[PDB]
Amino acid sequence: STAGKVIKCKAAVLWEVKKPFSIEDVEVAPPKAYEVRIKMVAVGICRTDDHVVSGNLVTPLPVILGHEAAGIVESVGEGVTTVKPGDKVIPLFTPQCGKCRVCKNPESNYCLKNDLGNPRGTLQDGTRRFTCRGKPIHHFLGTSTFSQYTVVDENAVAKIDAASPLEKVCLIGCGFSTGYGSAVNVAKVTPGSTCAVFGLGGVGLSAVMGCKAAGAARIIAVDINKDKFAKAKELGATECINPQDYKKPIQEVLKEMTDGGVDFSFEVIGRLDTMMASLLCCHEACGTSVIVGVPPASQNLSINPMLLLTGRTWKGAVYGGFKSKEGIPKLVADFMAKKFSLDALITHVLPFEKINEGFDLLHSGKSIRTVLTF
Amino acid sequence: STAGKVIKCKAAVLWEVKKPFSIEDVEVAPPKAYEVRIKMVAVGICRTDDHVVSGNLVTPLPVILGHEAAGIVESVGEGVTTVKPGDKVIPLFTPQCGKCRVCKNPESNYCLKNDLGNPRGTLQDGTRRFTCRGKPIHHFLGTSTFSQYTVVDENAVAKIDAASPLEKVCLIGCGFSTGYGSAVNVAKVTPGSTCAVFGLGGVGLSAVMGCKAAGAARIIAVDINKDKFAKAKELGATECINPQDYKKPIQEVLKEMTDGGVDFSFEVIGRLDTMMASLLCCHEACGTSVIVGVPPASQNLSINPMLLLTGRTWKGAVYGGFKSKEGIPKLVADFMAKKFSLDALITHVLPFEKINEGFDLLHSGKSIRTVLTF
Ligand SMILES: NC(=O)c1ccc[n+]([C@@H]2O[C@H](COP(=O)([O-])OP(=O)(O)OC[C@H]3O[C@@H](n4cnc5c(N)ncnc54)[C@H](O)[C@@H]3O)[C@@H](O)[C@H]2O)c1
Ligand SMILES: NC(=O)c1ccc[n+]([C@@H]2O[C@H](COP(=O)([O-])OP(=O)(O)OC[C@H]3O[C@@H](n4cnc5c(N)ncnc54)[C@H](O)[C@@H]3O)[C@@H](O)[C@H]2O)c1
Ligand SMILES: [Cl-]
Ligand SMILES: [Zn+2]
Ligand SMILES: [Zn+2]
Ligand SMILES: [Zn+2]
Ligand SMILES: [Zn+2]
């Protein structure tokens, strides 16, 4: 079969920043102990991957990006007990090692074995597994799903329902579990709330579904692209507004609308001005503002600490607050039970070879999520 | 009998910034509808008062400062149903109007009628009640307790216990409520956790007490004044640190000491530099940092949003999140029920006439709380 042998397949490699992806043949070494090689069936295009092309998030190049995916277990290394070949699995971009301080706290999820903070670009043992033209190729968040086969650590992989529709379910890998857990787990939206969500992409639009599920009485959706509004309405927004229509700042407009500010505001975009506008617009004495978007490297916000003393809560979180390995299995089971649907978010399905066409649909706001099939 | 008209008494008026107080004769008009005129037994010098002297906190001048206090009710105005003459009372620096958005929400306590926000220096109906030399004098935070008599709004007064030692219990009116409540209500310190408290003043040592009441397993006290450590220890701090003994930044020292950071950090001082060190030293994936101190007017912090994205919660609160008319009696009842002792915090009891001396003690660092009696 292919077990124990080096595979040679196609993969999209980013050799330089602001350059297109090159689909090239690469060699994928076999799984060492406690690692798993997976065969990718579908991958979503998330904006974090774009942040590396653009140059906003620094990671060592050349690299194979990608992290929102679903596929089948091709082989397991020595010791892997949690999954067997043939199993359907989702690769997780934040490991749940189960043994660190973070993993043992019932409420923390940014495990210490992650590669998000200070990116090495390897797997958890410090070594890479992709070669292309003799050159060693770097990993990304220890998942690198823009390849036909990838090797991930065992604690970064979830085994999900064998009957799962893999080209729907890959969204639970990042975009959806993030969007919805922001509302339900991080901010902890209460029935009757008033919430604002800035940014209506695949992750922003799942924060709307999170608030609706929470029983929020009013969801205001903010975006400069008015074509996203119909979907936001369809998914739960009570109203959608576009900043460019007004002459006064969007935080003043929202305070004027909500009797002095919302109860919960979420920033799902990644830029400084919207994070500030999102703090300023929650109510001064009972609001919580949650940061979900990822900022450009080394950018600072000037905050007036008096903004916090009156009673505000400012906080952020990775992956919607989900412990990755326990969290994702259950969220896929709820999908099966028809507890929530994921169809409205997928607006385009393309073969993996068209990855660049997929990134261009994101750059024009023609797409919410584009799925790439292998 | 005075019930009915103007009283002439002594009060310390501050007519200019950085100029000493002057105990002068002022006239206190009788209480209007829903107001109360109180006879002052004892007042605590809190550092909020000195921020107005210095100019760090602005409010309209001339003014009679003071807010930490207890007295006996002389006459209540028409319509007053909560208190009656002869009752022991504590004026609250933050009203609990019972009817606004904030007041209706079970979490929030910063009532909308407060004068902390934008200071007018009047009572809730827009007018002043004091005169001195043919000129009207302003109120401070609607309480103005550095006067033998003062007039307050009914929703800013609490009826405490008849047998209450008004020279001890006056601390509950600000210092104790603030610091203890921060630990037990805003941060919500968990049994077994590890807290750090920056600032060992009157409010700061009350935070040490709350962290021990919530069950924090390690309470690290930070102060550049070594003479405060003994009391910190006495009250609960498992260890005391002085940032000048180090050649490395205090937040670094602290992370190295706690496996990457503290669970709960508190800044009870008011400098921007220490607010920064208090965010940085709590653990990036599970720590909560709380601002208690009041910052110098109009200064800004430059922070990186990534400090929050990993898992940090940053917040502020006033009155340790206690809702003032209901909370303050509950605490006095627990004091009377021998649940805690306010003894260690009082270090000097001077007669009111020596108020300028009490401010000097503060300014030299020899006092935790100085109580002025009438
Ligand atoms: N914290 C996490 O775990 C986590 C996980 C995944 C993604 N993210 C980050 O969160 C964000 C999610 O974005 P996405 O993946 O859903 O894609 P996205 O690019 O489709 O979302 C951006 C959306 O915000 C809108 N927008 C752009 N500028 C705007 C402005 N000035 N005001 C209002 N709206 C504006 C765009 O029109 C688009 O609708 C990204 O920043 C991604 O980097 C964070
Ligand atoms: N938010 C509120 O509800 C509320 C209520 C009461 C007081 N306060 C504020 O809390 C703060 C302090 O209260 P307090 O009454 O106990 O005052 P305080 O002056 O007695 O306490 C300040 C402490 O900080 C220490 N300190 C000063 N500079 C330091 C530095 N650079 N590093 C470390 N330690 C240093 C001082 O030695 C002193 O012990 C003040 O800012 C007051 O305005 C706020
Ligand atoms: Cl007047
Ligand atoms: Zn993503
Ligand atoms: Zn871990
Ligand atoms: Zn109120
Ligand atoms: Zn005070």
To the nearest whole Å, the CA of B306 is away from the closest chain A CA by 7
With beta carbons less than 8 A apart as the criterion, state whether A301 and A276 touch: yes
A136/A226 same-domain check: no
Q: Do the Cβ atoms of B304 and A303 come within 8 Å?
A: no
- Residues around ion ligand 4, judged by CB within 5 A, are A 46, 48, 174
Residue A110's nearest CA partner among A274, A301, A315 is: A315
Are residues A252 and A290 both part of a single domain? yes
Cis peptide before B106 (omega within 30 of 0): no
A116 and A35 inside one domain? yes
Give start and end residues of each alpha helix (H) in chain B.
Answer: 47-54, 101-104, 175-181, 204-214, 229-235, 250-258, 272-280, 306-309, 324-336, 355-364
Inspect the interface and report whether the beta carbons of A314 and B309 lie closer than 8 Å: no
Q: Is the dihedral of CA A330, A335, A337, A341 positive or negative?
A: positive
When CB atoms are compared, the residue of B313, B314, B316 closest to A310 is B316
Whether residue A305 is preceded by a cis peptide bond, meaning omega within 30 degrees of 0, is: no
Q: How far apart are CA B350 and CA B370, in angstroms?
A: 7
Q: How was this structure determined?
A: X-ray
A118 contacts chain B (CB < 8 A): no
- State the residue for tokens 């400090």: B307
Ligand nearest to the CA of B113: 6
Facing residue for A286 by CB, picked from B102, B302, B308: B102
Q: Would you state the structure tokens that stand for residue A347, as one six-digit string?
A: 């607006």
Substitution target in B109, B314, B318 with the highest count of A β-carbons within 10 Å is B314
Which residues does residue B138 pair with via DSSP β-bridges, in sequence order? B63
Neighboring chain A residues of B311 at a CB cutoff of 8 Å: 108-110, 316-318
How far B231 CA sits from the closest chain A CA (Å)?
A: 27
Which amino acid is it at A105? N
Strands A35-44 and A22-28: unpaired
How far, CA to CA in Å, does B349 sit from each of A93, B92, B145, B168, B342? 61, 22, 16, 11, 14
DSSP three-state, residue B110:
coil
- Is the same domain home to B341 and B312? no
Residue of A nearest to B192 (CA): A105
Within 10 A of A34 (CB to CB), how many other CB atoms are there? 18
Closest atom of ligand 1 relative to the A199 alpha carbon: 24
Query: At B292, is the secondary structure helix, strand, or coil?
Result: coil
Query: Which of B226-260 are b and which e, b meaning 16 or more Cβ less than 10 Å from the residue's Cβ?
Result: eebbebbeebbbbebbebeeeeeebbebbbebbeb
Which ligand is in closest contact with the Cα of B92?
7
- Reduced to 3 states (helix: H, G, I; strand: E, B; else coil), residue B360 is helix
Contact map slice: A 71-110 vs B, CB within 8 A: 101-102, 105, 107-110
Query: Which of B317, B336, B353 is the endpoint of a domain?
Result: B317
Chain A residues whose CB is inside 8 A of the B106 CB are none
Residues B119 and B215 in one domain: no
Best residue in A315, A318, A322 to probe B by mutation, most B CBs within 10 Å?
A315
Find the helix or strand (DSSP H, E) in which B11 lies. strand B7-13
- Quote the number of domains for chain A: 2
Please give the distance, rounded to the nearest whole angstrom, from the Cα atom of residue A94 to the centre of ligand 5. Answer: 9
CA distance B309 to A292: 7
Chain A residues closer than 8 Å to B308 by CB: 291, 314-316
Question: Is residue A126 located within the same domain as residue A225?
Answer: no
User: If you search the block for the tokens 């003894």, which residue do you land on?
Assistant: B343
In the reported structure, the alpha carbon of residue B283 is separated from the centroid of ligand 3 by a whole-number distance in angstroms of 51
Contact A286 B312 (CB under 8 A): no
Q: Which ligand is nearest to the CA of A291?
A: 1
Domain match, B27 and B143 both: yes
Distance CA B335, CA A164 (A): 60
The packing angle between helices B355-364 and B47-54, to 10°, is: 90
Q: Are A267 and A278 in contact (CB under 8 A)?
A: yes
Q: Which of A268, A289, A317 marks a domain boundary?
A: A317
- DSSP labels, B44-107: E--HHHHHHHHTSS--PSSB----EEEEEEEEE-TT--S--TT-EEEE-SS---SSSHHHHSSS
CA distances from B80 to A249, B35, B76 (A): 43, 7, 6
- Select from B283, B317, B351 the last residue of a domain: B317
Ligand nearest to the CA of B114: 6
Resolution of the structure in the document, Å: 2.5
For residue B300, give both structure tokens.
């800004």
Does residue B135 share a domain with residue B58?
Answer: yes
The burial of A67, by beta-carbon neighbours within 10 Å (0-12 exposed, 13-18 middle, 19 or more buried), is given as buried
Rounded-to-integer distance, Cα A83 and Cα A81, Å: 6
CB of A178 sitting under 6 A from ligand 1 = yes
Between chains, do A318 and B311 touch, taking CB under 8 Å as contact? Answer: yes
State both tokens at A356: 């660049």
| Phi and psi at residue A145, to the nearest 5° | -80, 5
The total of other beta-carbon atoms located within 10 Å of residue A72's CB is: 14
Cβ-contact A14, A21 below 8 angstroms: yes
CA A281/CA A255 separation, integer angstroms: 6
HEC letters along chain A: CCCCCCEEEEEEEECCCCCCCEEEEEEECCCCCCEEEEEEEEEECCHHHHHHHHCCCCCCCCECCCCCEEEEEEEECCCCCCCCCCCEEEECCCCCCCCCHHHHCCCCCCCCCCCCCCCCCCCCCCCCCEEECCEEEECCCCCCCCECEEEEEHHHEEECCCCCCHHHHHHHHCHHHHHHHHHHHHHCCCCCCEEEEECCCHHHHHHHHHHHHHCCCEEEEECCCHHHHHHHHHHCCCEEECHHHCCCCHHHHHHHHHCCCECEEEECCCCHHHHHHHHHCECCCCCEEEECCCCCCCCCEEECCHHHHCCCEEEECCHHHCCHHHHHHHHHHHHHCCCCCCHHHEEEEEEHHHHHHHHHHHCCCCCCEEEEEC
Task: Say which residue the tokens 């797409």 belong to.
Answer: A367
Which of A200, A203, A246, A291 for a ligand 1 pocket mutation test, highest count of atoms within 8 Å of Cβ? A203
Q: Do A102 and B298 touch (CB under 8 A)?
A: no
Residue B117 structural domain: 1-178+318-374
Distance CA B195, CA B218 (A): 6
The verdict on a CB contact (< 8 Å) between A302 and B306 is: no
Q: In this complex, is the C-beta atom of B316 within 8 Å of any C-beta atom belonging to chain A?
A: yes
The radius of gyration of chain A's CA atoms, rounded to the nearest angstrom, is: 20
Tell me if B208 CB under 6 Å of ligand 2.
no
Ramachandran class of A277: left when φ > 0, alpha when ψ lies in -120 to 50, beta otherwise: alpha
Q: Are residues A192 and A305 in the same domain?
A: yes
Structure-token match 């008599």, residue found: B149
Q: Does B22 touch chain A (CB under 8 A)?
A: no
Query: Is residue B10 located within the same domain as residue B90?
Result: yes
* Ligand lying closest to the C-alpha of residue B322: 2
DSSP H/E element including B351? strand B346-351
B107: nearest CA in chain A? A286
Q: Which residue has the tokens 């090159």?
A: A22
Residues making up the binding site of A for Zn(2+): 46, 67, 97, 100, 103, 111, 174
CA distances from A320 to A177, A182, A206, A235, B30 (A): 6, 5, 11, 18, 57
Instruction: List all residues 6 or more positions away from A87 whose beta carbon is below 8 Å from its beta carbon.
Output: A72, A73, A159, A162
Q: Do B272 and A107 touch (CB under 8 A)?
A: no
Asked if A295 lies within 8 A of B302 by C-beta distance, the reply is no
- Residues A120 and A151 grouped into a single domain: yes
Q: Which residues of B touch A302 (CB under 8 A)?
A: 300-302
Q: Which residues contact B188 (CB under 8 A, 6 or more apart)?
A: B214, B288
| Spatial separation of the C-alpha atoms in residues A132 and A226, rounded to whole Å | 43
Ligand 1, atom 15: closest residue by C-alpha:
A47
Query: From the CB of A224, is ligand 1 less than 6 Å away?
Result: yes
| Rounded CA separation B261/B250 (Å) | 11
How many Cα atoms within 13 Å fall on the side-chain side of residue A306? Answer: 11
Give the position, in ligand 1's atom list, of the atom nearest the Cα of A292: 1
Radius of gyration, alpha carbons of chain B? 20
Q: Check if A311 contacts B (Cβ < 8 Å).
A: yes
Q: Which residues surround ligand 7, an ion (CB under 5 A)?
A: B 46, 48, 174
Which residue ranges of B are tagged as binding site for Zn(2+)? 46, 67, 97, 100, 103, 111, 174
Q: What is the C-alpha separation between B362 and A188, in angstroms, rounded? A: 42
Q: How far is CA B283 from CA A370, B72, B290, in A?
A: 36, 47, 13
User: Do residues A148 and A188 both lie within one domain?
Assistant: no
Here the CATH number for the domain that contains residue B298 is 3.40.50.720
> Cβ(A272) to ligand 1 under 6 A?
no
- C-alpha span between B2 and B212 (Å, rounded): 47
Cβ pair A311:B318 closer than 8 A: yes
Round to whole Å and give the CA distance between A55 and A53: 6
Cβ of B269 below 6 Å from ligand 2: yes
Domain CATH code at residue B75: 3.90.180.10
